[PDB]
Amino acid sequence: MTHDLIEKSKKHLWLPFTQMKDYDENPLIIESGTGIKVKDINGKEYYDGFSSVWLNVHGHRKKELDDAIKKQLGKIAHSTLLGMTNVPATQLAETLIDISPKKLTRVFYSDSGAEAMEIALKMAFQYWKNIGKPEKQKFIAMKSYKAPIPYVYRSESGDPDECRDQCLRELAQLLEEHHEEIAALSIESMVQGASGMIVMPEGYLAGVRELCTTYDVLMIVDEVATGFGRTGKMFACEHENVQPDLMAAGKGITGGYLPIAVTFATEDIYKAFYDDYENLKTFFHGHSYTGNQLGCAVALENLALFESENIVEQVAEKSKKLHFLLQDLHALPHVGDIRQLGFMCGAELVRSKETKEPYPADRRIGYKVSLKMRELGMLTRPLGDVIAFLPPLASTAEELSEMVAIMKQAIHEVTSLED
């Protein structure tokens, strides 16, 4: 029965990033998917409006991807990368090196995007110790030490450039007086995802790259949310032509089918761990399913679809009519901000335009909208009161428009009643 599936789900599960009480009152259990839609156990279909949490590229039950996994099963599902390697992980690594910024020449596999970033930090940490400067041991976290990222929406000036230069100036001052103790800087690539789909103003990222080079601090670029076509580029750091020292990737790498993550490094960083085992230069980390054949085999096929379906350039083109559709959401009294880079978008809801006072958090306004969209046939995740919109890269222009329409209807319906 379907009512006992539901019952067993709230008895045995503990779900990530969710208040289980919320899950218990509004369960949803997915059974299948095809194209850009998923279907629950009652047969109700939804638009994957968030690409299963921004990792689904070509939709579900993408035949080429289905076949690439079946093909790989005919050989071997998993052999280890500890001390040795396998065919698909080696082949993928070459293809990954080709499509990434030019100075990134090394691929270290891991199991999640979060582990890839932790790996980037250990690499940066050990890097300085290995080249004889163990005083460089602190990190700059871009919101250790904290530096501000520009958020133009709520921001005294409301100016992309003033916000850019003012934040850069704060970074610049932090380096000036701490840099000799700092190993690295970690920053999302063009878009702050979880912090509300906040797009960086032009010149900002190229500007922190520049400061990092000047202060001998490694720059870690997190591309887990933005990588593989999401922003209309293969990697988002191309928007500003920045070369990372370290780059984390995952999610869409497999077209969204399986867990694979990568930390890219430069050759200069790589060679600081290359030496006789005796002189202790080895980077002692890495997991047990790292470079899983099944995940690498579906990734290879994923990147073959990018190149044979000009996916990145389709995203960039489709993003043009998407712009106008999203900008029309401003017609609603409780929108307030619309942010977009490629298929990476957010609509920040407010109780009042130009005070921009948010709703009190206890009004659950992002969550109520997510729930309304859900009854309307569309899945997405609210980040606070920002409605995220990250549809599959393979999303049609008509599918794009159907999704924005459901989103607009949901925002209006919840929000018309709040105040």
Add this chain to the structure above:
Amino acid sequence: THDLIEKSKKHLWLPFTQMKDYDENPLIIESGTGIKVKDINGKEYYDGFSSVWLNVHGHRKKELDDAIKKQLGKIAHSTLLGMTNVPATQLAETLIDISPKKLTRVFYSDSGAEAMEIALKMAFQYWKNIGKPEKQKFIAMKSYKAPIPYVYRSESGDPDECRDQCLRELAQLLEEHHEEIAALSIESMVQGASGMIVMPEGYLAGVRELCTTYDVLMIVDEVATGFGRTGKMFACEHENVQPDLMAAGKGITGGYLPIAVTFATEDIYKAFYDDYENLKTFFHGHSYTGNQLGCAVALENLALFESENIVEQVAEKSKKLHFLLQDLHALPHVGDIRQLGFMCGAELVRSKETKEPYPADRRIGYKVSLKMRELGMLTRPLGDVIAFLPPLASTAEELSEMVAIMKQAIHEVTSLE
């Protein structure tokens, strides 16, 4: 092909491996069948370490292949953030059925390492949520440090004495520090990467008793020992111990895909269950959590455990495995053999009366591993401990074939110091 070899040296950066070593002796696997793998040159190897302690039924197991192809016909991945899917829901029920009584909750992640980190987050935040933020430190077993028994390197060589000594050091530590301690983290029955050291009879149960007495959460690591490896489904069954938190992975999927789990009691779960405003949510998790493809193969893996009574015959085959390993003990540089089920280790030593280790210098474990490779067998040394963790599907004849190769290899490298 031939080209692959240099490509791998140019593009990869491998985990826990000095790349200069890899370049000098590259190994690139192309396929597998049963408990053997084959490299790009056609050479076959016994998978003597189960692809690092995760491969259960061998490679290209029909039922596991079929379970993934079937799940592909439905959906590969949909999220567990705020919602769920059928395979992850079904699997959770099954994992609850086969895990210790007191564990009722399944939290998914991507790796066994992540499962353990989640367990610590659960413990740290549990105490905060119920108004004991002072309980924020941890005991890690070898933050605070207490000793695990290493009977071979002990001055009594007596299990009970080593056990009781290490328990009273834990006691002493808890007595003065308990009010600041959130949790204690320990491997279940066997210290894996530390060199395959089997815990003495009564020790784990003893640590469970002290955690309960001093109100500290017991986090149990079953990532390496889990799923029949030690001749029980979970090694903690050996001493009937009930964890508060338990990390698992590896063999969960028969070794096919990355799925990991953190088990929890309902008491711990409830401290995060509240109306959203009360700020009690466990805000952690990730992307491919409860992946359908991984959960699908895991469900089938577990069905095979049942229909093939994997556990009852790991325990059976271990009996004769004991004798094969004890004969290995006859080599002048095998100082110790440790075994619990299919989890074994041969600690190498410059000489036995002295138990004196080779200088790490000489790379004895490493050159034994390379020798074994030449001989058609893969394993990973832990320092100068040669690990032997063969697939649970290994036959009695395959075990002895693998032991004979290990023996030859230790003999040739070692007699040669």
